[PDB]
Design a protein around this ligand. Structure first.
Ligand SMILES: Nc1ncnc2c1ncn2[C@@H]1O[C@H](CSCC[C@H](N)C(=O)O)[C@@H](O)[C@H]1O
Ligand SMILES: [K+]
Length: 451
């Protein structure tokens, strides 16, 4: 037997996997156990969650391994779920008409946690002994010690409503251990003003870096010499009433860039971005990021222009506009709600000017009500912003209602009808006027189906 030459006990000892029997670890020949390691994810400690981390720098496009597991046909797997109380699909990979369930048996790939806006790796179909399987390939350069994150390419309402928003920087250390490790970069300070956008009142104790203190004082980073860009994304660490640090799962931290965005410090935002701040960083519980926090600051401000400028900076630096809150609203969703008509138009114009490859990507994300951004505008009666979106992307109806996928087309017709179900005669005639506008070239039959 050839498996007698495979020592999975040593594989797991080398990877730091401590919650699998050796007879349940299923290696593949392309597994790069030299490049990765399994560790606890401190954020997930209350469920003993683990993750897969880079043991060294990994170049973009490197193969990590094969998603191994127990093999079922689709029918067999449904029968399994039906017969095994408490089993679920958390580890089930649907590929090639088969199901590869890594819930009980598998390899290192079973430890990669989820993100759809900060994934640095992806599942891709490959061939193995003439059958289709899933392999993991990095989609960005990974720095040693960062967690690998991957999009599961499925919808799970429980996921959007209960998962944490994981970052590549979320590791095995607690907030206490992180502070101890980098103590010389932190100083304890008292908040001198309220800051509801991060749930801080005047007088709260917070551990801050020099960069963070500069942001909170409203000083300019560019005027400072001897700034240590290493801790640019090291977080503000809140300190509890018992004078102990709040752990990562007890309170969201934030970065200097998050704060600069919320506060509208345009030049500081530019400086932070140019010095490598993760413009896609997300707070663990809330999901708030530079984009959402800029929108928040805009909602609470007399000077809205600096926030529009910050959104412009972010978009110029390839910020991920497909990030979404817990209701699966993307940035365009929520910006439709927060920005006035002129500013919403200006931001869509910025995005236009970045010349996105697939504009339709922005129009295929649906929120918890199954509304894409156009349906969303209409359901909130933002006729002007709906027209702005239609002018941005005239092909919207063509590509999402008259595609070659009749299932998708009908789902979208039904979702559009749902979005407008509460219109009165006046709103319906305004909508029909917009839709009959020459530029969309909507066929009469689709118009019938829409109203
Ligand atoms: N972003 C996230 N926040 C919280 N839990 C997550 C998560 N991403 C993945 N998970 C957990 O991990 C499961 C996928 S298997 C991923 C490995 C798992 N964390 C483990 O230690 O075995 C999900 O069903 C969910 O329970
Ligand atoms: K403010």
């Amino acid at each position: 037997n050839a498996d007698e030459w495979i020592d999975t006990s040593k594989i797991m000892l080398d990877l730091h996997i401590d919650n699998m029997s050796s007879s349940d670890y299923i290696p593949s020949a392309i597994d790069r156990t030299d490049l990765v390691m399994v560790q606890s994810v401190h954020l997930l400690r209350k469920t003993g969650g683990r993750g897969l981390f880079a043991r060294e720098d990994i170049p973009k496009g490197t193969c990590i391994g094969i998603y191994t597991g127990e093999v079922y046909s689709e029918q067999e797997f449904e029968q399994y779920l039906k017969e095994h109380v408490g089993s679920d699909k958390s580890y089930a990979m649907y590929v090639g008409g088969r199901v590869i369930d890594a819930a009980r048996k598998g390899n290192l790939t079973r430890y990669i946690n989820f993100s759809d806006s900060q994934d640095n790796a992806e599942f891709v179909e490959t061939t193995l002994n003439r059958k289709k399987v899933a392999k993991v390939i990095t989609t960005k350069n990974i720095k040693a010690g960062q967690q690998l994150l991957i999009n599961y390419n499925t919808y799970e309402e429980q996921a959007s409503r209960y998962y944490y928003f994981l970052n590549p920087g979320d590791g095995w250390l607690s907030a206490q251990e992180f502070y101890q490790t980098y103590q010389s970069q932190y100083r304890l300070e008292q908040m001198p003003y309220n800051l509801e956008g991060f749930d801080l009142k005047a007088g709260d104790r917070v551990l801050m870096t020099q960069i963070g203190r500069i942001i909170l004082a409203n000083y300019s980073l560019a005027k400072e010499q001897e700034l240590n860009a290493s801790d640019i994304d090291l977080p503000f660490l809140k300190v509890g009433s018992d004078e102990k640090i709040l752990d990562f799962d007890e309170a969201d931290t934030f970065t200097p860039l998050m704060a600069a965005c919320y506060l509208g410090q345009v030049e500081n935002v530019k400086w932070l971005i140019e010095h490598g701040a993760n413009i896609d960083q997300q707070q663990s519980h809330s999901g708030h990021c530079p984009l959402s926090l800029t929108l928040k600051g805009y909602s609470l401000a007399k000077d809205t222009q600096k926030y529009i400028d910050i959104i412009q900076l972010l978009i110029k630096n390839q910020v991920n506009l497909l990030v979404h809150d817990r209701s699966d609203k993307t940035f365009l969703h929520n910006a439709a709600l927060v920005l006035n008509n002129l500013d919403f138009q200006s931001v869509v114009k910025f995005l236009i000017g970045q010349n996105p490859i697939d504009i339709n990507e922005y129009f295929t994300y649906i929120d918890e009500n199954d509304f894409d951004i156009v349906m969303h505008c209409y359901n909130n009666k933002l006729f002007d912003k709906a027209l702005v979106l239609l002018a941005f992307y005239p092909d919207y109806f063509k590509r999402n209602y008259m595609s070659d996928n009749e299932g998708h087309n009908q789902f979208n017709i039904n979702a559009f009808r749902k979005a407008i179900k509460d219109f009165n005669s006046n709103e319906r005639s305004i909508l029909l006027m917009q839709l009959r506008e020459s530029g969309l070239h909507l066929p009469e039959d689709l118009l019938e189906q829409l109203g």
